């Protein structure tokens, strides 16, 4: 008859309803990700044939690295608008520090967070 | 020119992006409510003329009361599906305990959570 | 015999264990407050004589107001260390904007967040 | 001089203060884990010589599996006290279903959650 047990926990996310001990086939619940995490895919899982469908993934935000920025000779462009943490899919804009210019082959000064990873621009004297 | 400061915190909710010190007019951010809380209204606030628009409200879940249920001679209908906490808008179904029947003027056995409040059915011997 | 039902939800906080439908006298659970909220009092509630003891309170963080700061002619002292949100009990330090000085009877430039409220210093030309 | 950047995010946890763009050596922040997650080790990280110390780990709760329980011929012992999710370090107690008894070499009926893993008892007809 295909009933399911309690829905699976996922990293950095939670279901939006109170977990029950058993669910009828065709039942569904939904996830939400922790605030700065981006929910990837379909938020809803459905019970069918004794198994829940695949939960979504909560994609990681990116944190600025002081060490990397110092090494690459860059700084945040907007000191009044500092995205110290950025959501996946969200862009962060840097500038070369005074006395430096973009190196060749460097990434653009504007760069996009993807699941924890920022590819930083590099500046050279 | 109408810039705004950091978005206002709301009870039982958070914005989905990292707060900035200043926002240009027309900028917007969005809220999400804590997992069992229901977001009422529009999740997005927009900055215009120096003020953020009105944030949404996170409506409270309902918790079952043992004392009230004992007093009213009721129990949860489905012992395998116990909604100890219910979301606003979600219904909970009771039954009269063995030897009792609904009193007249009683609420229906099925009853809906609204922002923390459940109106309980009452059974009589 | 004094058993208790599911522990009460509190604003901006959650219990650290999975809620059960019934608790024996002497049982206890504990709360934690949402990240920037300060837990006031004892985090643990205990079941006795059919009632849970009093839960703690989650004290609100304070958010900086651009409008108030502009009106009072002040700015954050440390632009590299901007406490846009401060925890209850945590202090925030302002400076008079260029061309202003503290007014008499003004609060000190350093001021402490208490449950959502900051008493701002005031500067005059 | 050894200043640090914004503290690192950790899975299933958050810092308790608002992130700053730079921290002086000797500064510290603290983490808390999401509600059913158990914080392993020291909650506080300290900035020294340009690096944060190692953050704690948030150990996973365990979810009961209907499929595994059905296969092993077991059920939760206390239907009024169902730990559908258990914290790391917390124990869950099963019983053999009617008509079964513990198999030899089986784990005890009482078993402890560790970071997502429950070792289930097994019953045989």
UniProtKB/Swiss-Prot annotation, chains A, B, C, D:
It is linked to Basal laminar drusen: Drusen are extracellular deposits that accumulate below the retinal pigment epithelium on Bruch membrane. Basal laminar drusen refers to an early adult-onset drusen phenotype that shows a pattern of uniform small, slightly raised yellow subretinal nodules randomly scattered in the macula. In later stages, these drusen often become more numerous, with clustered groups of drusen scattered throughout the retina. In time these small basal laminar drusen may expand and ultimately lead to a serous pigment epithelial detachment of the macula that may result in vision loss. Changing residue 78 to L: In AHUS1; about 40% loss of C3b binding. Changing residue 121 to S: In AHUS1; atypical. The chain holds residues 1106 to 1230 of 1231 of the full protein. Changing residue 105 to C: In CFHD and ARMD4; rare penetrant mutation that confers high risk of age-related macular degeneration. Expressed in the retinal pigment epithelium (at protein level). CFH is one of the most abundant complement components in blood where the liver is the major source of CFH protein in vivo. in addition, CFH is secreted by additional cell types including monocytes, fibroblasts, or endothelial cells. Sushi 1-3 domain represents the minimal unit capable of cofactor activity. The property to discriminate self surfaces from non-self surfaces depends on the C-terminal region made of Sushis 19-20. The gene is CFH. It is found in: Secreted. This is Complement factor H. Disulfide bonds join 4-47, 33-58, 62-113, 96-123. It comes from Homo sapiens (Human). Changing residue 93 to A: In AHUS1; about 30% loss of C3b binding. The lineage of its organism: Eukaryota, Metazoa, Chordata, Craniata, Vertebrata. Sulfated on tyrosine residues.
């Amino acid at each position: 008859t295909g009933k399911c047990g309690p829905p699976p926990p996922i990293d950095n996310g939670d279901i939006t309803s109170f977990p029950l001990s058993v669910y009828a086939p065709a039942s569904s619940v939904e996830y939400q990700c922790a605030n700065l995490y981006q929910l990837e895919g379909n938020k809803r899982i459905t019970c069918r044939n004794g198994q829940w469908s695949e939960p979504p993934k909560c994609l990681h935000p990116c944190v600025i690295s002081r060490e990397i920025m110092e090494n690459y000779n860059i700084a945040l462009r907007w000191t009044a608008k500092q995205k110290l943490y950025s959501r996946t899919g969200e862009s962060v804009e840097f500038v070369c520090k005074r006395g430096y210019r973009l190196s060749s082959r460097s990434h653009t000064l504007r760069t996009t967070c993807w699941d924890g990873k920022l590819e930083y621009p590099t500046c050279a004297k």
